[PDB]
Amino acid sequence: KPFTCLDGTATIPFDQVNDDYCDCKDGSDEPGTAACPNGSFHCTNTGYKPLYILSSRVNDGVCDCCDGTDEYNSGTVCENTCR
Amino acid sequence: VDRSNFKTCDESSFCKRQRSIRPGLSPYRALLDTLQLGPDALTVHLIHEVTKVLLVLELQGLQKDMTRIRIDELEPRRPRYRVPDVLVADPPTARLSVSGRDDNSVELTVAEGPYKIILTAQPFRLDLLEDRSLLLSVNARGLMAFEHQRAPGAWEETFKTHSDSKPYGPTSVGLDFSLPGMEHVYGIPEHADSLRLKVTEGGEPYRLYNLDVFQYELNNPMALYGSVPVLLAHSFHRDLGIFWLNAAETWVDISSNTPQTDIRWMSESGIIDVFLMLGPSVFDVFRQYASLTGTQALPPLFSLGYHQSRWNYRDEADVLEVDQGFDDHNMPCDVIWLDIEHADGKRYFTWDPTRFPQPLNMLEHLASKRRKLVAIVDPHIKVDSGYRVHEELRNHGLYVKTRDGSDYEGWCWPGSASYPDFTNPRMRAWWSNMFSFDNYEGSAPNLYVWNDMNEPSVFNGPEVTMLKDAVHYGGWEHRDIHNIYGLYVHMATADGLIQRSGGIERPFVLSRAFFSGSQRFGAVWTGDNTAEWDHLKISIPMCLSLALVGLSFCGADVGGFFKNPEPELLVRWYQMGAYQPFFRAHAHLDTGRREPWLLASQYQDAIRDALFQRYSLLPFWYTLFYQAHKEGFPVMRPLWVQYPEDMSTFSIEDQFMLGDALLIHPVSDAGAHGVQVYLPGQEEVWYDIQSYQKHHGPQTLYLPVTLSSIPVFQRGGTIVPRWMRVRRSSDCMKDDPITLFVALSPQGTAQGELFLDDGHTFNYQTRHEFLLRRFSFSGSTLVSSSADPKGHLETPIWIERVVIMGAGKPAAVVLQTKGSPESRLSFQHDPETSVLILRKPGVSVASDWSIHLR
Numbered sequence: 001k002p003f004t005c006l007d008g009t010a011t012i013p014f015d016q017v018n019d020d021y022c023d024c025k026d027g028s029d030e031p032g033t034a035a036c037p038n039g040s041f042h043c044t045n046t047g048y049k050p051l052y053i054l055s056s057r058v059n060d061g062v063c064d065c066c067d068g069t070d071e072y073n074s075g076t077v078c079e080n081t082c083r
Numbered sequence: 084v085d086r087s088n089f090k091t092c093d094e095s096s097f098c099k100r101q102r103s104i105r106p107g108l109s110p111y112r113a114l115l116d117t118l119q120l121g122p123d124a125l126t127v128h129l130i131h132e133v134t135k136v137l138l139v140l141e142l143q144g145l146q147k148d149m150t151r152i153r154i155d156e157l158e159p160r161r162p163r164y165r166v167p168d169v170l171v172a173d174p175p176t177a178r179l180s181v182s183g184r185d186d187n188s189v190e191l192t193v194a195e196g197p198y199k200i201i202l203t204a205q206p207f208r209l210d211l212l213e214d215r216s217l218l219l220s221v222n223a224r225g226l227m228a229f230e231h232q233r234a235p236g237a238w239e240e241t242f243k244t245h246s247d248s249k250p251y252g253p254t255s256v257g258l259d260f261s262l263p264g265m266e267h268v269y270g271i272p273e274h275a276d277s278l279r280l281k282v283t284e285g286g287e288p289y290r291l292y293n294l295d296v297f298q299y300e301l302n303n304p305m306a307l308y309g310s311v312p313v314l315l316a317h318s319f320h321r322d323l324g325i326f327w328l329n330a331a332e333t334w335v336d337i338s339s340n341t342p343q344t345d346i347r348w349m350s351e352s353g354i355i356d357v358f359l360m361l362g363p364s365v366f367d368v369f370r371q372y373a374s375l376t377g378t379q380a381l382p383p384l385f386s387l388g389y390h391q392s393r394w395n396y397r398d399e400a401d402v403l404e405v406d407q408g409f410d411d412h413n414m415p416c417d418v419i420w421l422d423i424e425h426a427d428g429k430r431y432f433t434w435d436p437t438r439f440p441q442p443l444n445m446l447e448h449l450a451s452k453r454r455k456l457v458a459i460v461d462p463h464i465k466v467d468s469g470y471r472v473h474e475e476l477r478n479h480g481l482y483v484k485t486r487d488g489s490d491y492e493g494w495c496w497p498g499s500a501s502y503p504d505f506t507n508p509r510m511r512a513w514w515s516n517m518f519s520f521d522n523y524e525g526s527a528p529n530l531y532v533w534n535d536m537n538e539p540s541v542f543n544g545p546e547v548t549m550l551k552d553a554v555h556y557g558g559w560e561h562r563d564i565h566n567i568y569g570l571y572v573h574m575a576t577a578d579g580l581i582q583r584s585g586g587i588e589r590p591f592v593l594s595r596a597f598f599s600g601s602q603r604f605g606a607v608w609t610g611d612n613t614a615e616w617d618h619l620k621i622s623i624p625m626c627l628s629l630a631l632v633g634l635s636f637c638g639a640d641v642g643g644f645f646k647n648p649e650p651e652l653l654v655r656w657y658q659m660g661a662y663q664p665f666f667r668a669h670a671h672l673d674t675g676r677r678e679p680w681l682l683a684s685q686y687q688d689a690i691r692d693a694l695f696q697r698y699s700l701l702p703f704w705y706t707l708f709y710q711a712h713k714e715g716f717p718v719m720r721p722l723w724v725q726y727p728e729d730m731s732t733f734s735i736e737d738q739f740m741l742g743d744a745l746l747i748h749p750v751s752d753a754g755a756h757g758v759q760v761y762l763p764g765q766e767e768v769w770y771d772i773q774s775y776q777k778h779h780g781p782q783t784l785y786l787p788v789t790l791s792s793i794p795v796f797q798r799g800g801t802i803v804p805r806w807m808r809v810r811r812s813s814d815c816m817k818d819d820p821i822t823l824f825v826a827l828s829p830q831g832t833a834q835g836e837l838f839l840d841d842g843h844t845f846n847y848q849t850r851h852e853f854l855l856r857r858f859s860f861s862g863s864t865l866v867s868s869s870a871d872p873k874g875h876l877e878t879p880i881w882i883e884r885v886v887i888m889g890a891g892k893p894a895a896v897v898l899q900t901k902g903s904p905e906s907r908l909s910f911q912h913d914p915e916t917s918v919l920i921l922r923k924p925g926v927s928v929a930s931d932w933s934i935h936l937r
């Protein structure tokens with residue numbers, strides 16, 4: 001089954017989901033990367049409130065989520081500070 | 084501005100003496116019996132027919148089609164000043180040969196031609212030719228004037244309440260130059276005046292004397308903060324440049340005349356030392372001047388981002404609130420600036436113990452946001468026995484002195500203050516060592532420096548600067564060295580930021596005063612401008628005049644330093660500044676806060692849009708500055724530099740180009756509904772980068788604009804690299820993938836370059852750790868190859884997208900790169916705009932690759 005953009009703009013194979021290139025006008029195909037300019041990254045942030053952050057802040061080297069999940073491939077190692 | 088504080092030429096005794104000599108029969112003649120022709124120099128005595136004073140002319144042909152003229156006294160009572168530390172090396176010479184001689188003339192050939200020099204004996208005259216074309220004349224109007232040193236307003240001289248003891252009396256030197264065929268001359272910053280220099284016949288000469296001019300006004304020849312004695316002449320047929328290497332107060336007269344321009348230099352002391360740079364193209368002149376005074380220092384990438392400044396941010400919490408404001412309002416910013424109130428009572432290298440008690444922690448918080456900080460360090464030192472800097476400089480005799488041997492004391496920001504003698508190499512070594520992390524306590528690698536008031540500004544001094552008869556290293560007077568004092572401050576500071584890191588990190592230093600060679604040490608800006616529309620307009624000709632003389636890292640305070648700009652003016656200034664090299668918002672102490680998120684949502688969005696465009700273009704800016712660093716070519720360019728034969732561009736100053744690729748015409752009028760954009764070039768096409776509409780040159784296009792419009796056009800035949808993933812700072816972006824924008828020429832071709840490195844070190848030169856890629860399109864193929872193979876870099880940067888303007892719809896797109904199987908790329912095509920988007924090439928930027936459109 002292929003993926004459908006949440007705005008219906010296109011349909012792409014699921015290998016183009018989180019493939020680090022923006023294919024959906026709403027950014028819905030890259031919830032885990034910094035590829036889309038209008039996308040969002042969800043911090044699950046167990047132990048605190050879960051917040052959404054801009055996709056431009058995934059792997060920017062800055063710790064945005066208290067659980068540190070937004071920095072997984074940047075060289076910055078982020079500690080859990082949700083307490 | 085209060086003009087009575089500053090001398091006109093009439094109130095300057097040497098300018099009045101020199102300028103009272105009008106064109107006529109020169110009393111100087113060359114004694115051809117004394118002529119001696121050497122390899123590196125021809126020497127011949129000159130004599131004043133009346134005074135019988137004997138001078139020595141040292142004429143040198145130089146490699147790269149340059150001639151150097153030096154004239155000094157034959158038997159001086161005391162040595163005259165020869166400007167040091169400006170020339171990056173001793174210029175390689177070319178041999179002169181005698182190719183003709185009569186009773187009154189000697190013809191000289193440079194190497195084996197085609198450049199010749201004719202020395203006329205009486206009256207003394209020099210003519211420069213390529214073959215039989217006369218290029219330039221020296222002393223053709225007989226304005227040469229050399230005041231010899233007599234026995235120690237001609238002598239003791241007073242201005243207002245300041246007395247110049249003038250122990251050496253009149254020592255001024257002057258010389259004129261004739262430029263046949265030239266009607267347009269440019270350069271000699273810094274002046275709040277038009278790009279094309281005006282004739283001075285009916286008014287004041289252009290003044291070159293580093294001065295602090297409070298609330299300076301526009302379109303007048305008053306001397307501002309910096310002085311670069313370089314004039315460029317441009318015509319349809321050739322390009323020329325004059326480099327008057329003198330550090331004293333200098334006036335420049337320009338007169339028009341078959342069309343011909345005459346240039347006259349008048350300096351207070353020093354020898355006559357002038358370089359003639361013969362082109363023939365303006366890029367030949369750039370290289371010629373760069374070989375003498377060096378090239379623009381490669382800025383660390385972050386300093387090309389957005390700088391947020393004001394006088395002043397209150398304390399650490401304010402700085403951190405500003406930092407958070409940018410992130411909370413989705414606006415990028417690399418550097419926040421700390422003006423003079425961050426220090427302890429304007430004692431530099433210190434921190435205010437209440438408002439900045441823990442500077443290291445503040446710098447650590449900014450480093451966690453991957454942002455920098457800039458702290459101001461001025462070259463005036465408070466007279467204060469509790470101030471360690473003042474005690475060390477006083478105890479070591481490193482201060483400028485008066486004639487009685489005491490340390491000079493003037494008035495500035497901290498009250499009474501002394502001035503380190505930056506012409507003393509021991510003083511500069513001391514200064515550089517003070518920037519070590521152990522001496523400058525509270526500093527960290529992400530702290531950088533701003534040198535201000537280094538004219539030097541002296542509040543109680545004549546014309547708000549240092550007395551003429553102050554004494555510097557080696558006994559030289561301040562009048563001898565004035566225009567390089569700021570340069571020495573810039574240099575010692577830039578050296579300090581390099582040495583504190585052990586020689587690894589590239590510096591960033593902003594300087595207000597400057598001279599020839601200041602491009603080697605960082606950035607400059609046009610000082611205290613005003614929040615008015617005309618000051619927005621004049622930022623273009625002022626930074627263009629600096630670009631033409633080597634200073635590419637130029638900018639003006641965004642929004643204006645004085646007064647409060649209306650919201651629309653602030654928006655238009657961010658759009659203007661976003662396309663200028665040094666991009667900093669700055670503001671006076673009594674202005675309202677104007678951080679970009681404090682405006683209404685409509686103005687915030689247009690300012691954010693402008694910031695995104697600047698950050699997206701960082702790879703393009705970085706490459707232009709690498710080209711300036713290696714070749715000496717300016718980043719910001721007048722339209723005539725790219726179109727030397729389109730005489731309708733010779734005076735344009737509401738429009739400019741970045742490299743050869745982008746033509747910029749910012750909106751600079753309140754309530755404007757359109758701009759007149761001149762798109763030059765025969766057989767040339769231009770793409771509106773916002774609508775992708777293609778326009779054929781030459782034409783004047785009326786383009787409607789809104790508040791969010793920045794009229795920008797890409798030239799056909801260029802490839803512009805961008806980072807389309809805008810983050811909060813450039814450090815966050817420097818490993819992100821590149822998007823290539825290909826604007827096809829009418830022949831279906833394009834080309835461009837891309838430079839990459841670590842972004843902040845000298846590893847590119849000491850380890851050759853960099854990439855220089857060439858991108859080229861022709862036929863139906865886009866090819867990436869190495870433009871410099873010695874450069875290798877470990878980088879994850881890849882090509883995520885290619886945008887082709889002016890292309891038809893292909894049947895298939897094929898990518899090949901070594902080490903990989905042939906790949907098929909999907910694509911999108913807009914038939915109305917002829918734009919082709921290639922999806923995810925996915926190839927490393929360090930790899931050779933080629934994309935074919937079948």
Ligand SMILES: O=[N+]([O-])c1cc(-n2cnnn2)ccc1NCCCCCCN[C@H]1C[C@](O)(CO)[C@@H](O)[C@H](O)[C@H]1O
Pocket residue numbers: 297393394422423459494535542543595610611644669670671
């Ligand atoms: O007549 N007066 O108003 C006047 C008289 C006296 N005198 C005292 N004793 N005698 N005279 C002293 C001052 C003034 N002017 C008041 C302020 C305007 C000067 C601005 C200088 N601008 C530079 C410095 C800085 O303002 C902060 O470092 C930077 O922000 C900026 O970027 C720099 O260019």
Ligand SMILES: [Ca+2]
Pocket residue numbers: 016017018019020021022023029030
């Ligand atoms: Ca995708």
Ligand SMILES: [Ca+2]
Pocket residue numbers: 057058059060061062063064065070071
């Ligand atoms: Ca992050």
